[PDB]
Write a protein that binds this ligand. Structure first.
Ligand code: MG
Ligand code: MG
Ligand code: MG
Ligand code: MG
Ligand code: MG
Ligand code: MG
Ligand code: MG
Lengths: 222, 196, 204, 243, 237, 235, 198, 250, 233
């Protein structure tokens, strides 16, 4: 997995590759690692895939309830405090590593959370097996006060580093842009540089090829 | 990690490097290790980041509740809350905390709570992996009742040595000055402190 | 030894033009000893199909748990659970057992009765959804299945062709796995009708 | 003695007598209070009555600092008031710990009202005989007044008054906002907003106050604080030159 | 208890107050650096062992309590106060501030007026000591109500005691030394015994003074007691 | 919970008293099916008929209940009965025998009668079911937790009046279609309204599944009730 | 290690269970009956860990007997086996699991068919023409795959079983002291007390 | 500390009445009128903002509440009981449904849960029933638009249109006259405004009336784009200004 | 006034009285008389035991709590058993944990606090027994009187139970003599046996009527009954 977060002058962008693996094997060639906690607070995870999704949804559900109750737009510091306190309680057994990013009435925010429940803040971050490839790009090109365009380019490039050099990452680049003024934009398969080439031959079989022992219709209704 | 707190004439100063590692990888080169638990009570954290953040958060909660009910807590009260948490949970915590604060009556104070959960009141304290390299130096150069600028220098020199030898320490040197004045954040960059 | 290797078993699901298919082997073994030649691993709640591979006791238990849960669903809601929702229900049911998981690899196939769109999904033992639109594979010959599917598959196959593809993928993967095989059953699922075929295969 | 008068079950008319009785308890101290919004502050004024001369005047107060940013004034007997203050403090500290931001004035009010509702519904708890007025300069909503009663009701106010002579003050302020046509006082200094509040308390109640007859709490951006006798004396002098 | 009267009162608490008025008289006096506590002990019979049914109680090391009404209810209140002061010291290290301690007792007494299954306490308690920032004296009623006092009395002699207390506040606005307050306490207890004269009484005094006891709570005994008894004997005649 | 000097249970008695004011429900068992018919309590033109079910509830695929009493109490019970049926299915891989489900439900009611100082549930049930031990079955249960089996029965208002009428026309050899008629006639005779129109009825059958070898529950849409009110000649 | 075999013929289910109880270096007993009747048309045989074995069987026996009296009815073999499976499935994740494997042979009156279920300690259930637990299946499954027919009579089944017992006596390292054989059909459960030299 | 009333406070009377439930229904009667009207393509729920002081700010107190993106509620009766019921209803939508099926409950099932919460206040020891009747309006894919009433006993009924509180009987009459099954949402908002004018004492404008609709998806109100199968909430509170616009044409 | 106010211990009368507690105090007045008194070196309990019949045993009034402590009872006997058991436990605890003999005074405080909780908890009655506690500790001989209201007082001598007012008046009179009865166990007992006499409308107190207990300086707490008391009649 390669996930990055990058702050720009008026917002925050996150991005991720689209490959899930069971050890050496590629399960999903185009899964979605970008998760919504609330409309303008988004999330990318690495580690135990079930864990990052569950902890995101639990906290997403409680953040919705908090917002309704308080009549206020959810804050990124709340997602953080709830995630970190939850993860801490489970003493790393919930293997969630997350980059959490958003805009709220207080401004724009970029945070990291580790499975034991420690958090950090910064202007640029990476996580995942591709984390070193992506950080090397970030450390090479990140400047203070980037425009929106530059930030998308830099994040996109960081994910590419992970896609090309980390065997744990591959396929596509997903992006989400959270600007202070606006609605969050989720950009699914913003880059697709790993198209499978056309096969050399068609493997469709002549009908009758398979030997059938017996047969019957299956009843669905009642 | 290299962290220290030093008492001086007008108060207390906390300082730290800014590097967090997982193995030999620098996870964060610009960490802020100086943590406020009240207006004029801060700490430096060492050991497990998860553990010390969770503790610092609980302490901050306790000191806010304390302030609502009884008024400004002393630095001793702060230290005692940390100790209670550390001692009582010694079997699932790896936490070493240095607590530093200023008030009007008691002036600048420093307490260190190392791994056991013991508490020690001290004129100055050092801790973190990098601290072992500066025991000799700090003991030779510390004096009571130093001025602000002398104290800033002592920490600056001390931590630059700690950073020089410890691979776990490094980045920028952050400091917080705590006096009647006031709360002041200082930062110092490699290009400066490496030439010391 | 490893709970997911004791009993043997494979399930695979594919999408085609206005249909889905789901297939499984019939083996139930106890390590090296083959015990049953008739252990089916695909089930259905109304028009929603679920294959489960893994420890057989958990295969049976989860079938009973999902019959139970879908029956109550239909009673309160006055309609049959759709593929997407059932997928969610499997995922949350599995995650609920996060630190004492069922040792299974479930697979869901079906056609949404409102949109008519074919749907398949897979899960790991703790409920992580593999959302994939072509094929899903599970079991002690999953490497063999991924291999077979990635070569054999092409999109929008007619039901009679998709039948050949899924069968060929299953048979040949099963024959490279000591713990799979011993009979195979294939379901072709068309909105309107569902045909079930037992395949002839090597009995070793 | 019917049971519908002893615990919070419905009367045949659909009323809750113990709740209504609890409102009556709120006046038993014969103190009036009022609250106004400035341009970037919020002020609360309450009467201070120290009848017994064996009392230490500094410990006689019905204004509480709930948090760094929220003040609360109570109309009602002190034991129930302190019970409510303690709880509000605990709820405020807890909110900050759990959600990482300071508890908003209105949200604390909604929460304290919810606790009140419960006493309205469960038999074994008596309602508290107090009305709670919460003030702050909210970071999202600006200067705020939210008031909660033994019924579990709460709402936001442009200004408000509470106590036996609540009505006098209310209609006075109502008259004021009719003229100004805006929903706050135009003034930048919280000192002037305090003076306005004291001034209109004086008219409405037709009484003069020394520095020991008043008690003042002021909320600004990020503090809430109470004035000392001397700060108040300085306010009284200021108003006596022109009115 | 949980029951409001149609006009917002609580009759059970009002009745609890009657138990207090019925009680022996007790007082406290705040001085320039401390606090003095005194109480009337009715000698029912000559068989009561003198000096040996101590009514004044210490909490932690720096706080005295005296009460009038049902004695068992006071002891209950002090047990709870001791637990509450221990818990404070355990967590914050410092001995509990008097205002902090007041509220702890306050919240506990108030709690016993919320629930139909509990009765209010049948005491008023006068208490205080020295903390980080001076001397404090408090009085706590069966309702949970409490305020800070310059001087306080409760029990049967309450009215005359308050009258005497009020005089002292007027003659000595520049603060009363701790040694003076002791004498005056002995006097005041004598001048509220008038009422309950039928049976004999014995005097108990305790004090907490920054300069006289180092801010620790102590019992007045020996020569200091005898001298305060003499002052009161000579000033009643 | 307490006994009266007569050895009766006040709260139970008063709960039955409450049920006698509720809309009448009728159950008739024939040899090839069962009928459940119920009258909705004084309605209004604006009430949604198309998405309403207050008196007839499905317990599983082979069992249904007609309710007389507080709906909200009935939903509590219905829900536990549904769970109970599924536990049984899961434990034995067989659909629950009707009696067993009725007995469990009755036992929960009996419980409220004997301990805990909560009020009983103000509910009476007619159960319509099929199983392979007893075929078609009809049972009744009331707030006491007592239950009994029947060929035809009513609950709620006018049971005494409705019971006499059923006694009169009921014959063992009946088809379900004859039972349909009997139930509608009996409600028609016993309403406290002008006529028994479709909009005031809930109706359901448990038949031998058109042509199969299987059991089918038909919960009548309003349209079907209007049409079946045509045949039996009550327009 | 305990031999537990089952074969389902046309009109009955036959169970055979070894008679030995061995602890350490000693055979303590040579007439052990590894069987409990659950209901007049359902029999269960069991093998596994020392104490768990009887405790489980008797607990199941108590439960089915309770049902019978409550309902004045006999649960079908399919129902009893589902019930048994669930008890084992719960047990496998409890503090101390029951280590018991069972065969359930029953005659179903509603269908008029014999039925044989094999369930191991994990709650793995399967319905089989013939089955075994432990090592004995390593010999008997292949023998029966060869010699078994679906339409065998009871006597044919007993011959087929004699063949299995012969094979086990020849090849199995342990002395299991013969079996006790029980037949379950429409007229209930009966023991063939002549097998040791039949 | 610890409860003394572990017995039902709602018991049956000799006549079969459940007194406390009746008395709560009397509280609903005293409450300000609210109503719901269902159209072909929407539901409207409306009520009056009976303010307690001219010094209060009536926008800070909403009587119409979002429960899910597709479900809203209004009430008549005791406001504080409503407020806590709304809290619990939002929560139970998550705990009993969304955390299980990954989607929001259909209208009838959420109503069903609210109904249960109310039923329990009718049976449990030491409590009084809620003093409210709710109208709940919603949409869901498989049932379309719906409107439900829920009463202090826990009973619910589906309505084409209804009214609760003070002038309910007159308003129910005015609605039976005016409702048909070809009504468009705009027409139903109109009828709701007319019906409400009879009930309203003082000023009748976008500041004194509170009105919300269950209509089509507001893809703007979502807060994000890029997921095409997410089109936004169907619940929408009309603004002050939006209301006055329909009052001119009234 | 006494009307709706004596239902439970959880209700004040409009005079500020607790009737359940005052009623409990009335069971003491029913109980058979007992006397306690002490000097500087010993403390003595004397009790008149009461039979239920001429065919019965006179029921015991004296209970040993520790080697240095015991008590006599007047009122509900099973209530005395609850409290003496608790006191035995408190004595024991103090020995085991601190190797300390429990102060008679602390025993007072403990019993008092225990009685107190029962004067304030819904659904429980107050204790209906009065107790006289004697012991020898590190500050000498002690006598205590315990009332179920929770009031405990230290006295040189006292009596509780029916007609006890006589004995009390006698002890009030004798005071200055028995207080000095030191190092003479038998004279102090004689003074207690005589004090109890002033409380007889009964009979001439017999070898069964009489229960005597003693504790002091070099004497563990010990109970005399039957033959061993004859030398005092
Ligand atoms: Mg790669
Ligand atoms: Mg370094
Ligand atoms: Mg695999
Ligand atoms: Mg194979
Ligand atoms: Mg209440
Ligand atoms: Mg109560
Ligand atoms: Mg007084």
């Amino acid at each position: 997995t390669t996930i990055v977060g990058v702050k720009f002058n008026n917002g925050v962008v996150i991005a991720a590759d689209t490959r899930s693996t069971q050890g050496p094997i590629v399960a999903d060639k185009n899964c979605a690692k970008l998760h919504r906690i609330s409309p303008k607070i988004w999330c990318a995870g690495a580690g135990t895939a079930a864990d990052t999704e569950a902890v995101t949804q639990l906290i997403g559900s409680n953040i919705e309830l908090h917002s309704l109750y308080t009549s206020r737009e959810p804050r990124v510091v709340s997602a953080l405090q709830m995630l970190k306190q939850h993860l801490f309680k489970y003493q790393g057994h919930i293997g969630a590593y997350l980059i959490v990013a958003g805009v709220d009435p207080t401004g724009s925010h970029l945070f990291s959370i580790h499975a034991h429940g420690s958090t950090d803040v910064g202007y640029y971050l990476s996580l995942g097996s591709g984390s070193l490839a992506a950080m090397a790009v970030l450390e090479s090109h990140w400047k203070q006060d980037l425009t929106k365009e530059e930030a998308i380019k830099l994040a996109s490039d960081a994910i590419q580093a992970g896609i090309w050099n980390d065997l744990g990452s591959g396929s596509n680049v997903d992006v989400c842009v959270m600007e202070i003024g606006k609605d969050a934009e989720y950009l699914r398969n913003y880059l697709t540089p790993n198209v499978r080439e056309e096969k050399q031959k068609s493997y469709k079989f002549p009908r009758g090829t398979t030997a059938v022992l017996k047969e019957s219709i299956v009843n669905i209704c009642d | 990690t290299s962290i220290m707190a030093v008492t001086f004439k007008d108060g207390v100063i906390l300082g730290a490097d800014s590097r967090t590692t997982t193995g030999a990888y620098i996870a964060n080169r610009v960490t802020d290790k100086l943590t406020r638990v009240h207006d004029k009570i801060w700490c430096c954290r060492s050991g497990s980041a998860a553990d010390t953040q969770a503790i610092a958060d609980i302490v901050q909660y306790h000191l806010e509740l304390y302030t609502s009910q009884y008024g400004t807590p002393s630095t001793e009260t702060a230290a005692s809350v940390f100790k209670e948490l550390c001692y009582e949970n010694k079997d699932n915590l790896t936490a070493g905390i240095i607590v530093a604060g200023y008030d009007d009556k008691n002036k600048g104070e420093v307490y260190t709570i190392p791994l056991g959960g013991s508490v020690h009141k001290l004129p100055y304290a050092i801790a973190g992996s990098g601290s072992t390299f500066i025991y000799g130096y700090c003991d030779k150069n510390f004096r009571e009742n130093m001025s602000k600028e002398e104290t800033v220098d002592f920490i600056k020199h001390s931590l630059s040595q700690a950073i020089k030898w410890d691979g776990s320490s490094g980045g920028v040197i952050r400091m917080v000055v705590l006096t009647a004045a006031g709360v002041e954040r200082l930062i110092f960059y490699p290009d400066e402190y490496e030439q010391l | 030894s490893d709970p997911s290797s004791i009993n043997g078993g494979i399930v695979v699901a594919m999408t085609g033009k206005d249909c889905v298919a789901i297939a499984c082997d019939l083996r139930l073994g106890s390590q090296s000893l083959g015990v049953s030649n008739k252990f089916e691993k695909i089930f259905h709640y109304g028009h929603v199909f679920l294959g489960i591979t893994g420890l057989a006791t958990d295969v049976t238990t989860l079938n009973e748990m999902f019959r139970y849960k879908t029956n109550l669903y239909k009673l309160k809601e006055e309609r049959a659970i759709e593929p997407e929702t059932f997928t969610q229900l499997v995922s949350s049911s599995l995650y609920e057992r996060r630190f004492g998981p069922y040792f299974v690899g479930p697979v869901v196939a079906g056609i949404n009765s409102k949109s008519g769109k074919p749907f398949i999904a897979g899960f790991d033992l703790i409920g992580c959804i593999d959302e994939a639109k072509d094929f899903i594979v599970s079991g002690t010959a999953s490497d063999q299945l991924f291999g077979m599917c990635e070569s054999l598959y092409e999109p929008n196959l007619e039901p009679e062709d998709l039948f050949e593809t899924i069968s060929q993928a299953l048979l040949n993967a099963a024959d490279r796995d000591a713990l799979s095989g011993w009979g195979a059953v294939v379901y072709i699922i068309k909105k309107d009708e569902v045909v079930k075929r037992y395949l002839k295969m090597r009995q070793d | 003695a019917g049971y519908d008068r002893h615990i919070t079950i419905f009367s045949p008319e659909g009323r809750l007598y113990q709740v209504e009785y609890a409102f009556k308890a709120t006046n038993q101290t014969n103190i009036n209070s009022l609250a106004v919004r400035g341009k970037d502050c919020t002020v609360v004024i309450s009467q201070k009555k120290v009848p017994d001369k064996l009392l230490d005047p500094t410990t006689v107060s019905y204004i509480f600092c709930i948090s760094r940013t929220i003040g609360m004034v109570v109309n009602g007997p002190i034991p129930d008031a302190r019970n409510a203050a303690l709880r509000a403090k605990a709820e405020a500290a807890e909110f900050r710990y759990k959600y990482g931001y300071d508890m908003p004035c209105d949200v604390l009010a909604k929460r304290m009202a919810n606790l009140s509702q419960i006493y309205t519904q469960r038999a074994y708890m008596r309602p508290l005989g107090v009305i709670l007025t919460f003030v702050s300069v909210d970071e999202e909503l600006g200067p705020s007044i939210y008031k909660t009663d033994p019924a579990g009701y709460y709402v936001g106010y442009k200004a408000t008054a509470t106590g036996p002579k609540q009505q006098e003050i209310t209609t006075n302020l109502e008259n004021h906002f009719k003229k100004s046509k805006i929903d706050h006082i135009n003034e930048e200094s919280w000192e002037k907003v305090v003076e306005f509040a004291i001034t209109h308390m004086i008219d409405a109640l037709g009484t003069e106050f020394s520095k020991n007859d008043l008690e003042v709490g002021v909320a600004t951006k990020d503090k809430f604080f109470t004035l000392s006798a001397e700060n108040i004396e300085e306010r009284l002098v200021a108003i006596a030159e022109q009115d | 208890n949980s029951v409001f009267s149609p006009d917002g009162r609580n009759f059970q608490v009002e009745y609890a107050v009657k138990a207090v008025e019925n009680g022996t008289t007790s007082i406290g006096i705040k001085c320039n650096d401390g606090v003095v506590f005194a109480v009337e002990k009715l000698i029912t019979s000559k068989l009561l062992v003198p000096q040996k049914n101590v009514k004044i109680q210490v909490v932690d090391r720096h706080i005295g309590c005296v009460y009038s009404g049902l004695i068992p209810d006071g002891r209950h209140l002090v047990n709870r106060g001791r637990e509450e002061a221990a818990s404070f010291k355990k967590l914050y290290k410092t001995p509990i501030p008097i205002p902090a301690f007041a509220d702890r007792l306050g919240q506990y007494v108030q709690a016993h007026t919320l629930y139909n299954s509990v009765r209010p306490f049948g005491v008023s308690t006068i208490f205080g000591g020295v903390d980080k920032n001076g001397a404090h004296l408090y009085m706590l009623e069966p309702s949970g109500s409490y305020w800070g006092y310059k001087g306080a009395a409760t029990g049967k002699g309450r009215q005359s005691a308050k009258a005497e207390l009020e005089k002292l506040v007027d003659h000595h606005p520049e603060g009363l030394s701790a040694r003076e307050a002791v004498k005056q306490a002995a006097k005041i207890i004598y001048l509220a015994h008038e009422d309950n004269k039928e049976k004999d009484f014995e005097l108990e005094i305790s004090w907490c003074s920054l300069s006289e006891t180092n801010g620790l709570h102590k019992f007045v005994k020996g020569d200091l007691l005898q001298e305060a008894i003499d002052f009161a004997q000579k000033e009643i005649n | 919970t307490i006994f009266s000097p007569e050895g009766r249970l006040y709260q139970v008695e008063y709960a039955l008293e409450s049920i006698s004011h509720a809309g009448t429900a009728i159950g008739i068992m024939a040899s090839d099916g069962i009928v459940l018919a119920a009258e909705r309590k004084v309605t209004s033109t604006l009430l949604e008929q198309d998405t309403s079910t207050e008196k007839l509830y499905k317990l599983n695929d082979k069992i249904a209940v007609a309710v007389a009493g507080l709906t909200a109490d009935a939903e509590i019970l219905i829900n536990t009965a549904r769970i109970h049926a599924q536990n049984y299915l899961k434990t034995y891989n067989e659909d629950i025998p009707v009696e067993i489900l009725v007995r469990r439900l009755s036992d929960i009611k009996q419980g409220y009668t004997q301990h805990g100082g909560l009020r009983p549930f103000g509910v009476s049930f007619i159960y319509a079911g099929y199983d392979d031990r007893y075929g078609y079955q009809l049972y009744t249960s009331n707030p006491s937790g007592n239950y009994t089996g029947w060929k035809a029965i009513s609950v709620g208002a006018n049971t005494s009046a409705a019971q006499t009428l059923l006694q009169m026309d009921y014959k063992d050899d009946m088809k379900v279609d004859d039972a349909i008629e009997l139930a509608l006639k009996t409600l028609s005779k016993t309403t406290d309204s002008s006529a028994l129109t479709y909009d005031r009825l809930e109706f359901a059958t448990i038949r031998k599944g058109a042509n199969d070898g299987e059991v089918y529950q038909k919960i009548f849409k309003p349209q079907e009730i209007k049409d079946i009110l045509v045949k039996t000649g009550i327009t | 290690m305990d031999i537990i075999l089952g074969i389902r013929v046309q009109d009955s289910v036959i169970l055979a269970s070894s008679k030995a109880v061995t602890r350490g270096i000693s055979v303590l007993k040579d007439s052990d009956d590894k069987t409990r009747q659950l209901s007049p048309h359902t029999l269960m045989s069991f093998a596994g860990e020392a104490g768990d074995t009887v405790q489980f069987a008797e607990y199941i026996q108590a439960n089915i007997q309770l049902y019978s009296i409550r309902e004045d009815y006999e649960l079908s073999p399919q129902a009893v086996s589902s019930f048994v499976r669930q008890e084992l499935a719960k047990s496998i994740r409890s503090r101390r699991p029951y280590q018991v494997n069972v065969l359930i042979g029953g005659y179903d009156k509603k269908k008029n068919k014999p039925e044989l279920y094999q369930i191991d300690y994990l709650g793995t259930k399967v319905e089989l023409p013939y089955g075994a637990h432990g090592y004995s299946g390593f010999y008997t499954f292949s023998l029966l795959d060869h010699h078994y027919r679906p339409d065998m009579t009871t006597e044919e089944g007993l011959d087929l079983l004699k063949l299995c017992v012969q094979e086990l006596e020849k090849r199995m390292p342990m002395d299991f002291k013969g079996v006790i054989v029980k037949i379950v059909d429409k007229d209930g459960i009966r023991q063939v007390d002549d097998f040791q030299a039949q | 500390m610890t409860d003394r009333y572990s017995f039902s406070l709602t018991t049956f009377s000799p006549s079969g009445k459940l007194g406390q439930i009746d008395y709560a229904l009397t509280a609903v009667k005293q409450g300000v009128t609210s109503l719901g009207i269902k159209a072909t393509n929407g539901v409207v729920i409306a009520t009056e903002k009976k303010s307690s002081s001219p010094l209060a700010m009536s926008e800070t107190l909403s009587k119409v509440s979002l429960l899910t993106p597709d479900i809203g509620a209004v009430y008549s009766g005791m406001g504080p009981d409503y407020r806590v019921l709304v809290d619990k209803s939002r929560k139970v939508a998550h705990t009993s449904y969304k955390r299980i099926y990954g989607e929001y409950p259909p209208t009838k099932l959420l109503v069903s849960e609210v109904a249960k919460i109310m039923q329990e206040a009718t049976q449990s020891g030491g409590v009084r029933p809620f003093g409210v009747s709710l109208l709940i309006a919603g949409h869901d894919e498989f049932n379309g638009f719906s409107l439900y009433q829920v009463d202090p006993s826990g009973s619910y009924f589906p309505w084409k249109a209804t009214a609760i509180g003070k002038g309910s009987v007159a308003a129910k009459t005015f609605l039976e006259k005016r409702w048909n099954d070809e009504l468009e949402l705009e027409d139903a908002i109109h009828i709701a405004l007319l019906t409400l004018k009879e009930s309203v004492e003082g000023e009748f404008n976008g500041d004194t009336i509170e009105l919300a609709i269950i209509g089509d998806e507001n893809p703007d109100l979502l807060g994000y784009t890029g997921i095409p199968t997410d089109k936004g909430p169907r619940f929408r509170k009309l603004t002050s200004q939006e209301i006055n616009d329909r009052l001119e044409a009234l | 006034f006494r009307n709706n106010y004596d239902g439970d211990t959880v209700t004040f009368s409009p005079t500020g009285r607790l009737f359940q507690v005052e009623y409990a105090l009335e069971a003491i007045k029913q109980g058979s008389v007992t006397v306690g008194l002490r000097s500087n070196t010993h403390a003595v309990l004397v009790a008149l035991k009461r039979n239920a019949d001429e065919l019965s045993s006179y029921q015991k009034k004296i209970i040993k709590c520790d080697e240095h402590m015991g008590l006599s009872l007047a009122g509900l006997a099973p209530d005395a058993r609850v409290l003496s058991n608790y006191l035995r436990q408190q004595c024991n605890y103090s020995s085991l944990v601190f190797n300390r003999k429990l102060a008679v005074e602390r025993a007072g405080h403990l019993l008092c606090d225990k009685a107190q909780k029962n004067t304030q908890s819904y659904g429980g009655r107050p204790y209906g027994v009065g107790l006289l506690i004697i012991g020898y500790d590190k500050s000498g001989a002690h006598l205590l009187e315990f009332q179920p209201s929770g009031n405990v007082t230290e006295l040189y001598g006292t009596a509780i139970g029916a007609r006890s007012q006589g004995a009390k008046t006698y002890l009030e009179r004798t005071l200055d003599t028995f207080i000095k009865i030191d190092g003479n166990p038998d004279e102090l007992i004689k003074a207690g046996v005589e004090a109890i006499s002033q409380s007889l409308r009964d009979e001439s107190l017999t070898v069964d009527n009489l229960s005597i207990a003693i504790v002091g300086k070099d004497t563990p707490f010990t109970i005399y009954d039957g033959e061993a008391v004859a030398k005092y009649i």
